[PDB]
C-alpha cells in the first residue's frame, strides 16, 4: 500500500482479499465462544471457505468484486502466477532491460553490412556509464559526479564529450531488434556509427531478414555489457557473420529490390 505522486494510496488486490478472510476468521472465533447454534456456525464456516478460495484461486467458485463498484475480479494468488500477464511469461521468461532504446528506422545505403546508424542522443544515454569514465581519463571532468551533472542539461554538452564518445564505442557492437522477433536473425549485432538527427540507419540487405521496411517501422537497440557479452555479439551475432538461413540452407542476405534492379 503505497502513496502515489498525488499523495493518494494504491493498494494490491491481495489486501482486500486477506482482510476478508481475517474478518471471517475473527468473527468465527467470536461466534464459537459465544456458543452459536449450528445453523449460524455452519454458515460462518462456509464463508471462511470462499474467503480462502478467493485468495488462492479466485474465479473457481464466484468472483469477488473489490466493491460492488468495480466488477473487476480481485486479482488473486493464482491469477498472479498464470497468464500472459502472469508472473511467469511476463517476468521470469522475459524482462524489461536496463540499457536499451527505441527509434524509427530509416534506410542505410552507405553503411557496411556490419554497421548501422545510431543517433547521437541515443548513443549518449546508452553508454552514459562508459562515457562518464572516458570523460575522467581524458580531462573533461574532475570525476564521475561532475561529469554526470554536465550531461544532465542539454546546453551543457561540450564538443570534447562527443569526440570522447567516439573513443568509448570503438570496437563495440549493439543489437537491433524489430518485433515480431520471429527467428534468430530478428536481432542482429551491428557496429554503431554515430549519426546526427533522430533515427536509426539500418543496412539494406538485413532489411529483408528482419522483415523491416520503412513505412515508419521502429526498432529497439540494446547494449551488450561484459567483455564476454561483447565477444558473443561480435562473433556469432554479427550481421555479417550470419549470411545463410538456419531454416533452409539458402542465403538470407541477398540482393533485394533496388539492387537486383540496378544489376
Amino acid at each position: 500500500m503505497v502513496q502515489v505522486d498525488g499523495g493518494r494510496f494504491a493498494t494490491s488486490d491481495l489486501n482486500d482479499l486477506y482482510r476478508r478472510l481475517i474478518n471471517r476468521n475473527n468473527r468465527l472465533k467470536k461466534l464459537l465462544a459465544q456458543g452459536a447454534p449450528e445453523i449460524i456456525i455452519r454458515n460462518e464456516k462456509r464463508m471462511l471457505q470462499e474467503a480462502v478460495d478467493a485468495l488462492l484461486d479466485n474465479g473457481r467458485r464466484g468472483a469477488p468484486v473489490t466493491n460492488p463498484g468495480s466488477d473487476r475480479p480481485l486479482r488473486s494468488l493464482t491469477d498472479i502466477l498464470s497468464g500472459k500477464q502472469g508472473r511467469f511469461r511476463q517476468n521470469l521468461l522475459g524482462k524489461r532491460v536496463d540499457y536499451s532504446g527505441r527509434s524509427v528506422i530509416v534506410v542505410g545505403p552507405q553503411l557496411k553490412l556490419h554497421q548501422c546508424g545510431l543517433p547521437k542522443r541515443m548513443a549518449l544515454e546508452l553508454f552514459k556509464p562508459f562515457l562518464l569514465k572516458k570523460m575522467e581519463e581524458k580531462g573533461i571532468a574532475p570525476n564521475v559526479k561532475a561529469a554526470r551533472r554536465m550531461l544532465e542539461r542539454q546546453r551543457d554538452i561540450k564538443d570534447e564529450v562527443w569526440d570522447a564518445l567516439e573513443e568509448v564505442i570503438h570496437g563495440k557492437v549493439v543489437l537491433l531488434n524489430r518485433a515480431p522477433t520471429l527467428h534468430r536473425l530478428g536481432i542482429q549485432a551491428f557496429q554503431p556509427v554515430l549519426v546526427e538527427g533522430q533515427s536509426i540507419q539500418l543496412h539494406p540487405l538485413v532489411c529483408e531478414a528482419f522483415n523491416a521496411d520503412f513505412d515508419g517501422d521502429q526498432m529497439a537497440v540494446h547494449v551488450p555489457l561484459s567483455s564476454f557479452a561483447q565477444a558473443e555479439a561480435r562473433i556469432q551475432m554479427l550481421s555479417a557473420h550470419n549470411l545463410l538461413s538456419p531454416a533452409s540452407g539458402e542465403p538470407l542476405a541477398k540482393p533485394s529490390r533496388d539492387i537486383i534492379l540496378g544489376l
Binding site: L81, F88, R89, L92, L93
Partner: protein, 79 residues
C-alpha cells in the same frame, strides 16, 4: 506412444518448463505432491533463475576452456 506438441511440452520432466507453459494451477499441484526435484537440463528452467543457459557459450563442452600466453606458459612449467 505418439503425443502432440502441447501434451509433450507439459509432459516434460522438468516442471519449471511445464508450468511456464500452461495449466499452471495443474502443473504445479502434481509437481508439488510428487515433491519433484528439477535438474535444470533445459533452457526455460535456467532462464527463469537467471542462470547461464546450457547452450552456446554456456555449454559444458566449450564453457571450461582456458587461454594463456606462451610467456606465462613456460613460466609455470617448472613446479
Amino acid at each position: 506412444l505418439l503425443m502432440g506438441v502441447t501434451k509433450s511440452a507439459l509432459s516434460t520432466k522438468s516442471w519449471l518448463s511445464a508450468a511456464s507453459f500452461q495449466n499452471t494451477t495443474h502443473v504445479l499441484t502434481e509437481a508439488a505432491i510428487a515433491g519433484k526435484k528439477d535438474e535444470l537440463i533445459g533452457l526455460k528452467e535456467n532462464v527463469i533463475l537467471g542462470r547461464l543457459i546450457p547452450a552456446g557459450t554456456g555449454s559444458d563442452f566449450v564453457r571450461f576452456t582456458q587461454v594463456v600466453d606462451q610467456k606465462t606458459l613456460k613460466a609455470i612449467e617448472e613446479a
